[PDB]
Amino acid sequence: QSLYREIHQLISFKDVLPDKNLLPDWSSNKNPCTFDGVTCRDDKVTSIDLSSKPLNVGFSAVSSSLLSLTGLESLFLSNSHINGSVSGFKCSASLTSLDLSRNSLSGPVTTLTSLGSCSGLKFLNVSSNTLDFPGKVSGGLKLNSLEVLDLSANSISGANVVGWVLSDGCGELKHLAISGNKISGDVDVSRCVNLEFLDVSSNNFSTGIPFLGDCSALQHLDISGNKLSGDFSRAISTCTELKLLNISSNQFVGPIPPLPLKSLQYLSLAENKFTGEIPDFLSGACDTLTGLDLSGNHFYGAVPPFFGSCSLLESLALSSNNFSGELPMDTLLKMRGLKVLDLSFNEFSGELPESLTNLSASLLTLDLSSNNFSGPILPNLCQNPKNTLQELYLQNNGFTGKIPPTLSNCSELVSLHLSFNYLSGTIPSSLGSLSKLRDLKLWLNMLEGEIPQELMYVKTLETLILDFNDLTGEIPSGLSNCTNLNWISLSNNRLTGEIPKWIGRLENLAILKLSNNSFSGNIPAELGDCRSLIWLDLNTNLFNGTIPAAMFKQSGKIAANFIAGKRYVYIKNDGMKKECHGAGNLLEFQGIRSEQLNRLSTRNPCNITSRVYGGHTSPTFDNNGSMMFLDMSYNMLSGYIPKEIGSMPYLFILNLGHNDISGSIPDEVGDLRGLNILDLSSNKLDGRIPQAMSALTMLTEIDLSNNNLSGPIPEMGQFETFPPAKFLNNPGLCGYPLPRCD
Ligand SMILES: *[C@@H]1O[C@H](CO)[C@@H](O[C@@H]2O[C@H](CO)[C@@H](O[C@@H]3O[C@H](CO)[C@@H](O)[C@H](O[C@H]4O[C@H](CO)[C@@H](O)[C@H](O)[C@@H]4O)[C@@H]3O)[C@H](O)[C@H]2NC(C)=O)[C@H](O)[C@H]1NC(C)=O
Ligand SMILES: *[C@@H]1O[C@H](CO)[C@@H](O[C@@H]2O[C@H](CO)[C@@H](O[C@@H]3O[C@H](CO)[C@@H](O)[C@H](O)[C@@H]3O)[C@H](O)[C@H]2NC(C)=O)[C@H](O)[C@H]1NC(C)=O
Ligand SMILES: *[C@@H]1O[C@H](CO)[C@@H](O[C@@H]2O[C@H](CO)[C@@H](O[C@@H]3O[C@H](CO)[C@@H](O)[C@H](O)[C@@H]3O)[C@H](O)[C@H]2NC(C)=O)[C@H](O)[C@H]1NC(C)=O
Ligand SMILES: *[C@@H]1O[C@H](CO)[C@@H](O[C@@H]2O[C@H](CO)[C@@H](O[C@@H]3O[C@H](CO)[C@@H](O)[C@H](O)[C@@H]3O)[C@H](O)[C@H]2NC(C)=O)[C@H](O)[C@H]1NC(C)=O
Ligand SMILES: *[C@@H]1O[C@H](CO[C@@H]2O[C@@H](C)[C@@H](O)[C@@H](O)[C@@H]2O)[C@@H](O[C@@H]2O[C@H](CO)[C@@H](O)[C@H](O)[C@H]2NC(C)=O)[C@H](O)[C@H]1NC(C)=O
Ligand SMILES: CC(C)[C@@H](C)[C@@H](O)[C@H](O)[C@@H](C)[C@H]1CC[C@H]2[C@@H]3COC(=O)[C@H]4C[C@H](O)[C@H](O)C[C@]4(C)[C@H]3CC[C@]12C
Ligand SMILES: *[C@@H]1O[C@H](CO)[C@@H](O[C@@H]2O[C@H](CO)[C@@H](O)[C@H](O)[C@H]2NC(C)=O)[C@H](O)[C@H]1NC(C)=O
Ligand SMILES: *[C@@H]1O[C@H](CO)[C@@H](O[C@@H]2O[C@H](CO)[C@@H](O)[C@H](O)[C@H]2NC(C)=O)[C@H](O)[C@H]1NC(C)=O
Ligand SMILES: *[C@@H]1O[C@H](CO)[C@@H](O[C@@H]2O[C@H](CO)[C@@H](O)[C@H](O)[C@H]2NC(C)=O)[C@H](O)[C@H]1NC(C)=O
Ligand SMILES: *[C@@H]1O[C@H](CO)[C@@H](O[C@@H]2O[C@H](CO)[C@@H](O)[C@H](O)[C@H]2NC(C)=O)[C@H](O)[C@H]1NC(C)=O
Ligand SMILES: *[C@@H]1O[C@H](CO)[C@@H](O)[C@H](O)[C@H]1NC(C)=O
Ligand SMILES: *[C@@H]1O[C@H](CO)[C@@H](O)[C@H](O)[C@H]1NC(C)=O
């Protein structure tokens, strides 16, 4: 046996794969110690790693072939497209680690009890599978030799499952993760005297806090992501060695209870309902504290002063509370090690004390957004050379004055967010010297001047958001270089010129919003060479010419992906203030408060109060793909609607109102089976509403008023839902909701 067995066992596995090419250098009459994925010691196989290879075989193929291999010590099959479920099998006494994570194992978690045939198994990872819990609890896992067990991200829903895992003993257990399930009930790890790591986060625990007993070895405790309301302080009081405590995203209330700080490195109480003010007793942790997160509560007060002793604190998150007072920098500068600072969403007032520039060479993220500050953006900022700052967020404050050009000295800057302020002046050209910047956001300020040509010197830029400023001039040609741009927005400015034809060279452009400006010219067919475009808002401009049929070629071959994951707001235009134009205004909204959109009142006649949608971007498709949004109302368009208009299936919205468009509504509009909004009012359209539109099943708003249209209204579909107003000022038109055809 020995070799003969080793090779015949491995090739038998290979020979059951559906794609034997996945193990190309495995072969007969050749030593396995030369195989990719194999590890050998002294010419004997000791480990097999076939992770991230789509083997597409059942576990039964693994147990008989690989797990029975004599002398095998570890098997790694993570993300290897193994399905089926565990059953009994001869398991060599040498196997100590099995990793079956990110696979499709199924069935009750009681299947795992048969892994007890591996007398030496100490590390089991079956996370990110689909194991469920038998409706009823019974027996135990009965793998009481394990030191490490990860059951996370399965489909386990039940009560006292934790009790089940540990029923028959846990003396040896050192690491237990069960996050990402729907487990509820009680957690009693008091008999697991060696437990050092407990992750019961993102579960369905809503009763009591886990019982930890002596807690004489616990170093990592993560109970975040539940609905826990209780007295965790009592439960963790005896925990002498705790290094990390994450209780975020729960239902905890009240002031900060006492804690064991003698070894605490990370502490998060975020996303609860704690009240009060940072107690002084927390100073005892500054000897060891590396990360603090108090964000998302109801705390108040000012950054207490003892934080100077927190020399080790690498990150301070205090956002979304009721903190106040000038920047307590008298303390911050003592934080030699601080690298992330986040005071956003408080009421820290006053100006920026000039001594900030020192901390700009140790920090990597500075977030003062959505506060009450006022005063100039310190020009001397980033004077201390070797400025490592990567992100600057000062939006939604009371900051006034010119945009400092010194900001070009933060050579490592990747995101600059100064929106929602009262910043006057021009946009510094030195920002072009920010060779790594990806996000420039300065909308709703008082920024005069033209858009710097020097932005061509930024080969990384991705987003350029400058709405609601006093910008003037034309679109700088230099942006043809920013190949990676995916989100340009210049609305509510006084820009002029024409949409440059080189707009098509940006194969990453997903969003282009240019409303309430003084642009002009025929719309460019080149926009049809934008393979990422899903959002094109051109309303309230002076464009003219007819509509290029060629701007709809990419429909069907779009893949929107670069765009997903950014906080936004969509403001639906109410059909009330005729002074307000467009379907709606989509706007980036990272770090700004929804409660400050009223600042637009003096800049926009739209009654925003009614409609404000938001969230984080989540494109609907991935391949396939087509434009989702398309607004061009309140321009000087004319000619006939190209029948290519109806080639965008994922299209939600379509506004072509208040123009000079004629011809007959193409019968392709009925093909837009995702259409929720359709505006074509105030035009010169003739013909009949194509009965093909009766196939539109998702129309929530339609408007065809003020045209030369004639004939019947489709009695099928949704046209009977809509009111006469949406069909008025069309003499020939008849049919309910209009009068019957005489
Ligand atoms: C059970 O298996 C699962 C699935 O493998 C496993 O969960 C995964 O753990 C890894 C780390 O072990 C996670 O990936 C890490 O994630 C963060 C960013 O999210 C990074 O810190 C890590 O990158 C570091 O390491 C890289 C090389 O190793 C470096 O290039 C890099 O600079 C960083 O230093 C790393 O990517 C992963 O997200 C999870 N979850 C998944 C994949 O769903 C789990 O740990 C296993 N359990 C046990 C007990 O081993
Ligand atoms: C997370 O845990 C909570 C409580 O720990 C679970 O909520 C409870 O779920 C049960 C099981 O479905 C509900 O029972 C059902 O209730 C109604 C009457 O309320 C009745 O029609 C059914 O016969 C059934 O017994 C129970 O009401 C519910 N209790 C609550 C919400 O207070 C919850 O389901 C768990 N999972 C999730 C995903 O939240
Ligand atoms: C402390 O606890 C918090 C809350 O549990 C941890 O933040 C959480 O981090 C996880 C990944 O570890 C995030 O999960 C992912 O989230 C998205 C939803 O946005 C989802 O698509 C994925 O399925 C995935 O689960 C989770 O969002 C995030 N939660 C929050 C509120 O930010 C944090 O990492 C913990 N820190 C430590 C040091 O333990
Ligand atoms: C296109 O952009 C321009 C410039 O932002 C908008 O003009 C300005 O619009 C706002 C919104 O209504 C006006 O503010 C209002 O002013 C009056 C008195 O001035 C006051 O009673 C209201 O409470 C409100 O503050 C602003 O005056 C107005 N002025 C000028 C001179 O342009 C325009 O409305 C935008 N159009 C669209 C459709 O968004
Ligand atoms: C589209 O408009 C351009 C530009 O005209 C100017 O801007 C318009 C929005 C409108 O306000 C006009 O009164 C402006 O003059 C037209 O191109 C020429 O524009 C020049 C002035 O720049 C004018 O002397 C010419 O007569 C215009 N037209 C021609 C054929 O020479 C353009 O014609 C307009 N229409 C189309 C279909 O392109
Ligand atoms: C790509 C991303 C940057 C992001 C914009 C999208 O990913 C976003 O999520 C989408 C799919 C959102 C934004 C605005 C929302 C519309 C609100 O404006 C209405 O008036 C209603 C009317 C009606 O309620 C119907 O549901 C549709 C519609 C147009 C809403 C639909 C979903 C939205 C379209
Ligand atoms: C495990 O996964 C495989 C696919 O990876 C499943 O087998 C396939 O089942 C479909 C059903 O139509 C067939 O068309 C495929 O040809 C099958 N694959 C083959 C024969 O290689 C299998 O059913 C899954 N389930 C289990 C329990 O293993
Ligand atoms: C908590 O937020 C409240 C508002 O909800 C703040 O109240 C105002 O704070 C300013 C600060 O300059 C005072 O001038 C106002 O007088 C306060 N309002 C009232 C009605 O008195 C408050 O500052 C925050 N609380 C703390 C403790 O910082
Ligand atoms: C950081 O700021 C300093 C001071 O403003 C800059 O130093 C000057 O840089 C310019 C660049 O053209 C040189 O011509 C000057 O000679 C420099 N100073 C002196 C005294 O000669 C420095 O360039 C900035 N660094 C950046 C933006 O990376
Ligand atoms: C920015 O774009 C311009 C064109 O708009 C680039 O001009 C290039 O010049 C080089 C020689 O320096 C030529 O080989 C290229 O053909 C030109 N065009 C392109 C698209 O590369 C300019 O180099 C670009 N770069 C910067 C830093 O401005
Ligand atoms: C915010 O700043 C303004 C002046 O800009 C001041 O009147 C106000 O009291 C400050 N505090 C709050 C909580 O808004
Ligand atoms: C604007 O919003 C207010 C909020 O109360 C609403 O009552 C009012 O009718 C709206 N006005 C228009 C013109 O839409």
SS3 readout for 359-375: HCCCCCEEECCCCCCEE
Residue 322: both structure tokens together? 């009721």
The backbone torsions φ and ψ at residue 500, rounded to the nearest 5 degrees and listed phi first, read: -55, 145
Cβ-in-10-Å burial (0-12, 13-18, 19+) of 26 comes to buried
* Spatial CA neighbour of 245 closest among 219, 226, 271, 227: 219
Secondary structure of 679-709 as H, E, C letters? ECCCCCCECCCCHHHHHCCCCCEEECCCCCC
Helical H runs in 212-300? 232-236
User: How is 430-490 classified by DSSP, letter by letter?
Assistant: GGGG-TT--EEE--SS---SPPPGGGGG-SS--EEE--SS--EE---GGGGG-TT--EEE-
Which ligand 10 atom sits nearest the alpha carbon of residue 502? 5
243-251 CB contacts, 8 Å cutoff, 24+ apart: 243/219, 243/288, 244/219, 244/220, 245/221, 246/201, 246/221, 246/222, 247/223, 247/272, 248/224, 248/272, 248/293, 248/296, 249/224, 249/225, 250/223, 250/224, 250/225, 250/226, 251/227
Q: Whose CA is nearest to atom 26 of ligand 9?
A: 409
Distance from the alpha carbon of residue 543 to the mean position of ligand 5, in angstroms: 10
With vertex at residue 539, the alpha carbon angle to CA 533 and CA 541, rounded to the nearest 5 degrees, is 115
Residues in Cβ contact with 508 at an 8 Å cutoff, skipping those fewer than 6 apart? 462, 483, 484, 485, 486, 532, 562
Is 409 annotated in a binding site? The answer is: no
* Residues β-bridged to residue 569: 587, 614
Q: Whose CA is nearest to atom 3 of ligand 12?
A: 609
Helical H runs in 191-250? 232-236
Is 457 annotated in a binding site? The answer is: no
Integer Cα distance of 721 and 719 in angstroms: 5
Integer Cα distance of 441 and 589 in angstroms: 10
Integer Cα distance of 661 and 683 in angstroms: 5
Ligand 9 probe mutation, 378, 383, 408, 409, most atoms within 8 A of CB: 409
Instruction: Give the resolution value in Å.
Output: 2.4
Distance from the alpha carbon of residue 92 to the mean position of ligand 2, in angstroms: 44
Domain boundaries defined on the chain: 565-618
Is 618 annotated in a binding site? The answer is: yes
Residue 131: both structure tokens together? 């194991």
Please identify which residue in the block is written with the tokens 């002596």. Answer: 214
Ligand 1 probe mutation, 104, 121, 125, most atoms within 8 A of CB: 125
Q: Whose CA is nearest to atom 39 of ligand 4?
A: 604
Record: fold of 565-618: Dna Ligase; domain 1 (3.30.1490)
